[PDB]
Amino acid sequence: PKVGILGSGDFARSLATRLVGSGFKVVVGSRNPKRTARLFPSAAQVTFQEEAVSSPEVIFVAVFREHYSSLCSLSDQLAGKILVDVSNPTEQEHLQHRESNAEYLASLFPTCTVVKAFNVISAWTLQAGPRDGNRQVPICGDQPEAKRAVSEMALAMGFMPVDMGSLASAWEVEAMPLRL
Amino acid sequence: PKVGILGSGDFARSLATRLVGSGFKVVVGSRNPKRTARLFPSAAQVTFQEEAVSSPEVIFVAVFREHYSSLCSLSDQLAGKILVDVSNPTEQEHLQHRESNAEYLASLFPTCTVVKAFNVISAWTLQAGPRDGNRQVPICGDQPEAKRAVSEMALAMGFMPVDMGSLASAWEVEAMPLRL
């Protein structure tokens, strides 16, 4: 309660399903909430981006890297919040960009704290799996409190968080293969 | 409009999502609609079994074979309706039972007409895939009008129905491997 999600896609929608099933209150920020709401779990509140980010302490950024900067107008509402970078870049993206997606996201929102998590977990594993016991999510980032909040949430969702250290480890974590 | 689904599980929930995304009005019958509704797409109307099966012409039976007979008290409401058997039996189940699940279901509800379809399609393919591009659903059963109704529905969902003939083909169709 309340956990935030920015995005409207398969991953957003699977995250929301897992969070709702794990007893969290979920608020989703979408550009087209009317259309997006129809497919999302009823227990999730799908709303406009600016309204979705205002309440939660932890916000999953479930959009592609190319659309990160499109969230910049939310900066004032997001200040001091935890942002979770869940992105699973392609091999080419990984090698093309000097910084990790997580670090790029941190640079866009310097008043937020970024945690890398959930990139190795498939959308269907969120929906169906993992199952409520046993499957490892690598976590990093620069703030201990933020990492613990996301780790506890990972635990509540049935995953097993694995601390990979500071946000500088996000690049290596982003190379880890999607399972499976 | 309206298409019915009996059951509460990952497959039910994925079917509902695909149908809603394809412009159908969906009604779900669950024993625990309050709890079940929370995870289902918002556009689906989740309700009690008896109420769920009263309005639709086509009802997807998305429960395990062992629970088919538990639906017998719905017989009066289900009379003359099309039932879709989507079950994907294990190899052991397939070999253990002389008749196909679809034929078993037909035996339980003689005033209904059964169509075998969707057993080869994974829950994630329903959620995410197939894409809206092709991929092949085997269909059979004994009534041409019923098969056409389910085929149009398959097409609207972005699948490609493949006629496998009468319901006596269901056993062979039930042996077909599940596709990711």
Q: Judging by beta carbons within 10 Å of its beta carbon (0-12, 13-18, 19+), is residue B32 exposed, middle or buried?
A: exposed
CA angle B53/B58/B59 to nearest 5° reads 50
Q: Which two tokens stand for residue B5?
A: 């689904």
Beta-bridge partner residues of A160 = A136
| Among candidate residues B160, B164, B163, the one with its CA nearest the CA of residue B179 | B160
Alpha helices in A40-164, H assignment, sequence order: 49-52, 75-78, 91-96, 101-108, 123-127, 144-156
A40 contacts B41? CB cut-off 8 A: yes
Polymer length in residues for chain B: 180
Q: Which two tokens stand for residue B100?
A: 């196909």
Sheet-wide strand order for B113-117: B45-48, B26-30, B3-6, B58-61, B82-85, B113-117, B136-141, B160-163
Q: Phi and psi for B132 in degrees, rounded to 5?
A: 100, -10
**3-state DSSP assignment of residue A118:** coil
**CA A148 to the chain's CA centroid:** 15
Least CB–CB distance from A38: residue in B20, B123, B127: B20
**Is A66 within any annotated ligand binding site?**
yes
Sheet-wide strand order for A45-48: A45-48, A26-30, A3-6, A58-61, A82-85, A113-117, A135-141, A159-163
Domains within chain A, CATH numbers bracketed? 1-180 (3.40.50.720)
Q: Which two tokens stand for residue A84?
A: 């979770």
Residue of chain B with shortest Cα separation from A20: B39
Give me the numbers of helices (H) and strands (E) for chain B, helices first please: 9, 8
Q: Which chain A residues touch B38 with a CB distance below 8 Å? A: 20, 41-43
CA distance A9 to B122: 19
Q: Judging by beta carbons within 10 Å of its beta carbon (0-12, 13-18, 19+), is residue A98 exposed, middle or buried?
A: exposed
Polymer length in residues for chain A: 180
Q: In angstroms, what is the C-alpha Rg of chain A?
A: 15
> What does the DSSP 8-state code read for residue A161?
E
Distances in whole angstroms, Cα of residue B35 to Cα of each of A26, B32, B39, B47, B164 = 16, 6, 8, 10, 38
Q: Judging by beta carbons within 10 Å of its beta carbon (0-12, 13-18, 19+), is residue B23 exposed, middle or buried?
A: exposed
Q: Which two tokens stand for residue A87?
A: 């992105």
Amino acid found at A95: L
Interface test with B, best of A42, A45, A125 (most B CBs within 10 A): A42
Q: Assign 3-state DSSP to chain B and report helix, strand, coil percentages, each to 5.
A: 45, 20, 35
Q: Judging by beta carbons within 10 Å of its beta carbon (0-12, 13-18, 19+), is residue A88 exposed, middle or buried?
A: middle
Cα dihedral B55, B60, B63, B64, rounded to 10, equals 140
Tokens 């709401």 -> residue? A37
Interface list for chain B against chain A, based on CB atoms closer than 8 Å = 10, 17, 20-21, 37-43, 46, 123-124, 127-128
| Among candidate residues A39, A14, A10, the one with its CA nearest the CA of residue A157 | A14
- Other beta carbons less than 10 A from residue B161's beta carbon: 19
